[PDB]
């Protein structure tokens, strides 16, 4: 069934951020709840049905790890992608109630994010293009999917940044990059989310005891261009969790693990046979079911 603007009624905005606006909206043929991403764009009725026509595939990107989609139109000078709602909304709203992410909590979403690379990359020859915990949703039901990927080519260029990057260091430095540089966001995702913030620059030692000015542009990018990557702190993580993420943060990105190896890396492996109460752990920190 074809989605258009008048078959909508919005409920409430899930939120916003940088070039686009979300609702969580009613369809009201079909009776579901969506949530309703609205993309501003000045552009030329040719290349409109061009992302229209690029968005698409979406209706073939089914996986438990990748948010299911409605469907994509065009508005009013917005470009409409409807999805499914996340009722857990996304990680980084949930690490703002939890303080700090529990390794075994990130152990499930490390699986969920690899997996979710891995079918787009398998299925489909896409890479994600922005990994970072807001791009990274849940619900009640437990499921961690993966949202945002760049499956429109032509939408990514009509939109061609922020006061933290989660871009790889070859990303920053120009154009030499691909699969792997989605591997460095993970790495610097999952750690903030293990620490409480945004890891760079990493914590002093008071800092850390205390746990356990906001940088400028430039400092901030050359710091993760040209200063070592970040770390976990030790004691606090399992030395496989260390391991884990010092392999996504390496600089040199053929050097830095990619999916093949990370799906079979200790932390994972450990991860996989650990019993973990995700849906439990997640409503009781956001205060749902
Ligand atoms: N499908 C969804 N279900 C529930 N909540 C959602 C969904 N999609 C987006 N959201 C919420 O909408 C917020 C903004 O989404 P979005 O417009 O993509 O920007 P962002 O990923 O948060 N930051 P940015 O990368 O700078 O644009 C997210 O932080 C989520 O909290
Ligand atoms: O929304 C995005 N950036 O976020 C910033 C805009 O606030 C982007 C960017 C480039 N893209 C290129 N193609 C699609 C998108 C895309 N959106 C998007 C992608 C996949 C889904 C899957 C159905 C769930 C939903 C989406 F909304
Ligand atoms: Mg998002």
């Given at each position: 069934?074809?989605?258009?603007?008048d078959?909508?009624?919005?409920?409430s905005?899930?939120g916003?951020?940088?070039?686009?606006?979300?609702?969580?909206?009613?369809?009201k043929?079909?009776?579901?709840?969506?949530?309703?991403?609205?993309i501003?764009?000045?552009?030329?009725?040719?290349?409109?049905?061009?992302?229209i026509?690029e968005?698409?595939?979406?209706?073939?990107?089914?996986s438990?790890?990748?948010?299911?989609?409605?469907?994509?139109?065009?508005?009013?000078?917005?470009?409409?992608?409807?999805?499914?709602?996340?009722?857990?909304?996304?990680?980084?709203?949930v690490?703002?109630?939890?303080?700090?992410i529990?390794?075994?909590?990130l152990?499930?979403?490390?699986?969920?994010?690899?997996?979710?690379?891995?079918?787009?990359?398998?299925?489909?020859?896409?890479?994600?293009?922005?990994?970072?915990?807001?791009?990274?949703?849940?619900?009640?039901?437990?499921?961690?999917?993966?949202?945002?990927?760049?499956?429109?080519?032509?939408?990514?260029?009509?939109?061609?940044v922020?006061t933290?990057?989660?871009?790889?260091?070859?990303?920053?430095?120009?154009?030499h990059?691909?699969?792997?540089?989605?591997?460095?966001?993970?790495?610097?995702?999952?750690?903030?989310?293990?620490?409480?913030?945004?890891?760079?620059?990493p914590?002093?030692?008071?800092?850390?005891?205390?746990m356990?000015?906001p940088?400028?542009?430039?400092?901030?990018?050359d710091?993760?261009?040209?200063?070592?990557?970040?770390?976990?702190?030790?004691?606090?993580?399992?030395?496989?969790?260390?391991?884990?993420?010092?392999?996504?943060?390496?600089?040199?990105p053929?050097?830095?693990?990619?999916?093949?190896?990370?799906?079979?890396?200790?932390?994972?492996?450990?991860?996989?046979?650990?019993?973990?109460?995700?849906?439990?752990?997640?409503?009781?920190?956001?205060?749902?079911?």
């Amino acid at each position: 069934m074809e989605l258009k603007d008048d078959d909508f009624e919005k409920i409430s905005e899930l939120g916003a951020g940088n070039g686009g606006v979300v609702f969580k909206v009613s369809h009201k043929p079909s009776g579901l709840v969506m949530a309703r991403k609205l993309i501003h764009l000045e552009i030329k009725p040719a290349i409109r049905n061009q992302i229209i026509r690029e968005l698409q595939v979406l209706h073939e990107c089914n996986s438990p790890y990748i948010v299911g989609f409605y469907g994509a139109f065009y508005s009013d000078g917005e470009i409409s992608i409807c999805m499914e709602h996340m009722d857990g909304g996304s990680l980084d709203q949930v690490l703002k109630k939890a303080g700090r992410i529990p390794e075994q909590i990130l152990g499930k979403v490390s699986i969920a994010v690899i997996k979710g690379l891995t079918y787009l990359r398998e299925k489909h020859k896409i890479m994600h293009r922005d990994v970072k915990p807001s791009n990274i949703l849940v619900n009640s039901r437990g499921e961690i999917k993966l949202c945002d990927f760049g499956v429109s080519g032509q939408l990514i260029d009509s939109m061609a940044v922020g006061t933290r990057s989660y871009m790889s260091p070859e990303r920053l430095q120009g154009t030499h990059y691909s699969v792997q540089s989605d591997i460095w966001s993970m790495g610097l995702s999952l750690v903030e989310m293990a620490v409480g913030r945004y890891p760079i620059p990493p914590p002093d030692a008071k800092e850390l005891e205390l746990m356990f000015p906001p940088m400028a542009i430039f400092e901030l990018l050359d710091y993760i261009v040209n200063e070592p990557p970040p770390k976990l702190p030790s004691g606090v993580f399992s030395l496989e969790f260390q391991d884990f993420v010092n392999k996504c943060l390496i600089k040199n990105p053929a050097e830095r693990a990619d999916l093949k190896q990370l799906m079979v890396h200790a932390f994972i492996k450990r991860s996989d046979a650990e019993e973990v109460d995700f849906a439990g752990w997640l409503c009781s920190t956001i205060g749902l079911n």
